[PDB]
Amino acid sequence: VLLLDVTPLSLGIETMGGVMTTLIAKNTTIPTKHSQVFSTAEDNQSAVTIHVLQGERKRAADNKSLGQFNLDGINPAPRGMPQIEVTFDIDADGILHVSAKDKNSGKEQKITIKASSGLNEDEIQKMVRDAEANAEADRKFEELVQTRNQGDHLLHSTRKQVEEAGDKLPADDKTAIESALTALETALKGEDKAAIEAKMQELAQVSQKLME
């Protein structure tokens, strides 16, 4: 065939840190189904949101929002534990169906998106031109986030491990940590990846007695 229907922009959802995680690649012939499993950003999280996006940018904010819904009734468990199956399916007439199911609870939710939604051709071109042009920055962003999320996590973990102990060591151990949890807390707010890792490391240091 010399011609076929495709979905012209990548399709996905928003993941922790406000990054887009793709789910159907641009220029994928339709119809088509894809599924991917996800978890929860943090501990004891009973609900998630699924924000459906169209585009080629690493910033979820930079892409086109097709919609959203919540998935509730998830059993508060530790982060990474729940298994939330998300599925994007585009039928032959370009209708997009997005489902999310929590494998444990069996809780499921759904949204239907009209083929005509999203970005027009002019807008399509631009996206693509824009994505390419900002490739370096989108990369930088992505990693920034990957670091930010490791840190967020180190954060709750370190806090969980301390306020977990009694012989919190010479409390001088405890104190160095609190003073390092701050530095990190603050570093995190920045856009500078190195500074985050650099505080993660200092934190990793004055935590010997807690890592043990």
Binding site: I13, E14, T15, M16, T21, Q36, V37, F38, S39, T40, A41, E42, Q45, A47, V48, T49, I50, N70, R79, G80, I84, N149
Partner: peptide, 9 residues
């Protein structure tokens, strides 16, 4: 591998 979804409002 494994991605992470955040909390609603």
């Amino acid at each position: 591998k494994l991605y992470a979804l955040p909390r609603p409002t």
